[model samples]
Target: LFLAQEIIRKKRDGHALSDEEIRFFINGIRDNTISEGQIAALAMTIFFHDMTMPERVSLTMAMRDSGTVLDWKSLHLNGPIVDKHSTGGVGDVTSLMLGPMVAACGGYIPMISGRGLGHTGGTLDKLESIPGFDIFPDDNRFREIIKDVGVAIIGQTSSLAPADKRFYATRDITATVDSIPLITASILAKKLAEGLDALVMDVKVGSGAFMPTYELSEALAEAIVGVANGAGVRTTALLTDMNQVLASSAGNAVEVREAVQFLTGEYRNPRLFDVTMALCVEMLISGKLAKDDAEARAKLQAVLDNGKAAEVFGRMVAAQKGPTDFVENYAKYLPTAMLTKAVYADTEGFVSEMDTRALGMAVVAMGGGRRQASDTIDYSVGFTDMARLGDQVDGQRPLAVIHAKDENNWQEAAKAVKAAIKLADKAPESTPTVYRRISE
Candidate 1:
């Protein structure tokens, strides 16, 4: 206890902590051996300062060992078990698309996803938008889906890294969320518990992303990649830009429709395609499916274009008891909200920017997301087919619209949506989809 207290003091004073000290604090948090005051002190210390690489790795390993570690080797699962994680972003529906796409490319994806927070949407929230889509499954069903379709995504179970969940909730309220060490450990702990052989991380950096600066995002990526790789999990991270929303849809069922469109080859964006492919290559390389990144990318692209991607999506949906024909019958499966209203553009010009953070808050205001842990979500109430970043809209065209339970909220929500989009005479140059890649 003395050692733990000293370590917290050192970190509070902006001094480095040794791996042993980091492990002690992590174990304390995991075992509930540390007092609430001690834990809070440690959290506050890390909040202001940070951990070294060695300390970060030890911290991750300790937290991972705090709970059950899945053993996929015993299942004789074919080839590598791969997974991906995105730093939460607005309209970032990569998991819905990439999970099936990777499965189609002959990869195993055991995606353990999360819920929306602040202004960012969560994977579980989107899946819940379907009438009967369930995000939680027992272990037997989880393995069964993976075996049958090569992909399974669900919310992290209580048995899988509960320590991280406990710590994460406290961190959220305490404003200690921006700690790179904690972020790295929390992410790696859950993925490690998934029993993955390899992993890919899509770390978003921009105004709408959790890490708004490229440099900070890169640093976090490096820390995650370094720690996971050191702990014997092959991991790679891509720093992707989130300056613009990745999809034209921001709400639950709406993003599902957009993902279906992308998978079916009816709609595609060069930037979204590039970001998806880059992360796919990282998965392929980490899984040892290809010798080099270029070859892996080529293989992934071929599958995507040849309609195999759509087939994989179908298989996954069927495995999970969802509509296999979602591409054709999506409207039948998606839920409709109580109220819907369109918000027109105020003037005609190219859309220069969008404040996605505000858009997220608007959804929360309309009861689409939770304000407190126990708050219920109105899954049906969300935005659909939002205007793209560069599109030119006349004042007559709808820039965005809100789907709500009550018509009373429409007028104010429309005002919020109108303010979120900024129009200009000249469109901004398209930015690169991926910012950087980090690995050995």
Candidate 2:
């Protein structure tokens, strides 16, 4: 009782607690010994105050140990199991493309992902868009896929990281989701359960990302890296910009189709390309597959060009009971929706700026995203062929297009989309794809 009160007091006073005290609260929460009111109080406290590095590390360890940690060694999969995480963003479909890419390059990626809440797109949601695709694979099948294909991306099962799930939901409802320490513990605890040999994090910062500011995003990335390294996991973070949509599409099936385009080398988005390459470098170094970034890039490009990554992707789909031919025939599997409208620019000029968060919210308004936790998404309704930043646009050419169910939401959705893009007299200067890197 005193332990809980001391933790609450520490958070209340903006002071950090010792490892022992942090462990006590975690144990209480995991064991259901703490009341909901008590957890709410603690969450509110942490939202206002925050935890120190030691406290965050201790809490992460406790959360990771709260449930079963998979031992890939017993399965004889090989050395260096790698994984990646993103601080949720719009049209961020790296998991769909990166998992198979890394696996094809001879690395193990046990990617356990989640669903979207508001404007963010989730990996599991995208996989489910394929006809007959199942996100819940049994443990045996998961292990077999990793062994055979070098990768497996699945939904989080109840048996894996139960503590994090509980705390994550609480944090979400209690408005404590932005706490750097809480975010670090929540992410690392789950990744640690995969028994990763190394980890990479895509820390997004901008209007469409969870962290609204670059400084806060960097701090969060540092905290995550520090805690994971302290817990004996090799980790690195890339601070990527999210001021605009990462890709053209944002919904489940639509995003899957976009991912297929990327994997086939038919798509050319510099931001997506840069993020994928940087993540590949981190995965390679962590898995000991390459000694330097230049070497990793060469190896990564080879797998991508030889279609090995596409093959691994097919294997992963087969493991999850999804369509193996999605790589070659994704258009055939795309979700069907009612009205399709092309959005044209009001004036001929260069694409200057975008309100990413507002654009995502527009998708939500159009039934492409979830409005509430229990809301159902219209996977078929989404956007496509978006104009990139600094691209010169002719007023006659469509800047963006939307697909909707014709359920009387078209007018509102179109208005939202039109407001999302900003035109300027001159094209904006190109910005580097990767903004920064955080490591201990």
Candidate 3:
């Protein structure tokens, strides 16, 4: 019989453990037979010593097995089941439109997204801003929606990847959250349980990202691609820029507004379009819906231009209990801030640098996101019409339009906006929206 302490000690000493050991430990985590102290000890060892690819694959598969692994075989779906995952970022509401776009291009996307925490915005939180939008659909309903609408974005159920819940809790408290192998296992465990035929990961890099450096972000992207492919899923990752806000706005209802405009061709932020098209292209190619990038982009553009993507979005929203006419009359359904006004920079110059993490926190501070998990969000409070990195800001120009609950909150957010962005005499060099793509 293998003991948990022995496994921890082996990894503590920098020795790789077998698949059997990894599975045993993970199963113990799911069954409540593993002690919190033991879990933390093992997590700390993994943080320092790291895990081999096989160990990571084993860990992910074990966790995937700890709870229900969805089987779509019975559904008899004709199209490839594909999805996308992102390392959370500010103004990163790509999923709201990507799902519908891919679905219109003939890919089935059953996307399970999470809520916003700390400084990053979440897809489910953005979608919930629409009135009567339900994120929790029953299993049968979820499948039916996917089969009918070809896309459904819903919240994660506890029944999928239960082992990660405990393992992550231990790691979060033990300062082991940054380890690449552990992070890979944690993210892939939940995603693999979705039974995806193909998946694309948007691993963001820059000031607003989870990893502090570009090199680290690349490493994590490679690790995710490797482990997910090892576990028998076709996975690719895009290292997208998050140096500034990806969308023009950052908040719940406001970002949702941007997403609808994106789908309907009402207004499309150029940077957001590049990133969204890149991720969707990967999904289309990997899912075998298109032969190459050009074909994929053409297909996506056609759907957007002909309003097929927007139509699918509306149908999915209605199927999920949202308003039937959300895409057409979004402003009428989405909440508005009591005080809507512009926040200007103190000095007049070209935009140079942004502390994007701080900018996201400014939204959190305005009650747009969660400080603690229990905190209720102010959906209408956020910044809109945000100036880009190289845009000129003058007395006539503004940093962003702040949407706050009142004048006092608006003033507080304005101070944060000024502090987070830096003005320069000349514009700084601009970076690509997506830097690199990683695949196995």
Candidate 4:
């Protein structure tokens, strides 16, 4: 017989939990047998003293199997079954681009996403900004769309990694959200449920990343790559810099507009475009959709240049209940804020650095993110046309243009944006988009 108190005591004392013990606790977590008080207490203990690799792996697998596990083989998908995930970041919309890009190159993507909870933006939240975009499709509709359109980016169902759902909710309030072991398990549990044949992870680092320091980011990349591969799926991870926003826009509707512009080859940030293509290459190689790096790049570029990628995106959007004319008429469909303000730098110099989290919080202040679970999002509010690191800027080309509901909102956001940016006469060299890559 497994006892919750004894298992909690063993872990609380810093002992490595047995595989069976971990599974037992996870089963309890799934069935709703574990008391909330016990779950919260154990979460704190694990945070104070981390789990071993073996313990983390066991925990991740247990959580993944806690609910329904998908089977893509039965669908006989025409292309490779693959996906990619990014540790959350400000202005990170690569998934919006990557999903369609991979699908155009003959891959199937059932991308499960989350909502914005902290200082970072979420993909699901961005997609919902497009009216009539149904992220929670029924199983038959989801499977049919993935088979037909080659990609589907949607929200988590009530059935995927339900234990992780509970634990994450509790962790949010308990100050245990930063434990690497817990984070690794929480992230991979949902990915594992998708029954993916291959996966690539983008682990964000620097100021905007959840893991702020290089060492911590590297540790997370290693943990995710190792644990994911050990579960029998091919996996690779890249450590990417996030000292500045990943894209020029940060918010819901505006970022969706930014994504449409990118898909249509209208406007693309060099860094954002590069990172998206690199991840596509990695996923394609892992899925064996291409024989090598050269083949991978050729296939991806052809889809983008020949209009296949953009077409796939439009199809996916329409399949998921969004407007069929979204790609061409984004300016009409995506709601816009009533007032706009440019956040200016006080000094005349190069754009040296940014407190990226501060900028993200500025969006949250405008009702772009959730402070409470039931709060409605002001999808139209956000920052756009942001200056990149090392760019020369002044009052004319300000730090970023803020989109707000009114003059009062813009005034408050303008003050916050100015405080979040720094200007130096000569900015330092920009960090590379990708710092390092890790694989088995």
Best lDDT among the predictions, by candidate number: 3
> Which portions of model 2 show Cα errors greater than 4 Å?
1-3, 6-18, 40-50, 165-177
Model 3 compared with the native: what TM-score? 0.97
TM-score of predicted model 2? Answer: 0.92
Compose the digit string of candidate 4's lDDT tens values, residues 1-440: 39999998998998999888989998898788998777888988898888877888899999999888888888887777899988878888899999999998888998977775755678888898998999999888999999999999988887888888778877888788888888998899999899998999999888887786889989989999888888877999998778998889999998989888898889998899889988999999999999998999999988888888989999999999998988988888898899987878787788888988888889998889887768789999999999888988876788889899999989998988888888888978868898888999
**Candidate 3 lDDT score relative to the true structure:** 0.91
lDDT of 2 by residue, 1-440 (tens): 35677678777888777767777777788888776667778888877767666777888998888887888888876657999988877778778888988887778988887676656667777777788788778888888878987887788886666667667777777777767777788878888988988998899877666776788888888888899999988999998878788877777777888877777788846688888888888998888989998999999898888888877888788777877787887788768788878877778888889888787788777777677867777888878878888878885667777888884676677778778899899988876668888887
Clashes of 4: 0
Against the true structure, what is every candidate's RMSD? 2.6, 2.4, 1.3, 2.0
The parts of candidate 3 lying over 4 Å away from their true place are none
Q: lDDT for model 4, please.
A: 0.88
Per-residue lDDT, model 4, residue 64, is: 91
Lowest lDDT 10-residue stretch of candidate 2: 1-10
Q: List the residue pairs that clash in candidate 2.
A: none
Lowest-sum lDDT 10-residue window in model 1 = 112-121
Candidate 2 achieves a global lDDT of 0.80
Residue pairs with backbone atoms closer than 3 Å in model 3 (clashes): none
Backbone Cα, N, C clashes tallied per candidate: 0, 0, 0, 0
Clash list (residue pairs), candidate 4: none
Any residue pairs clashing in model 1, and if so which?
A: none
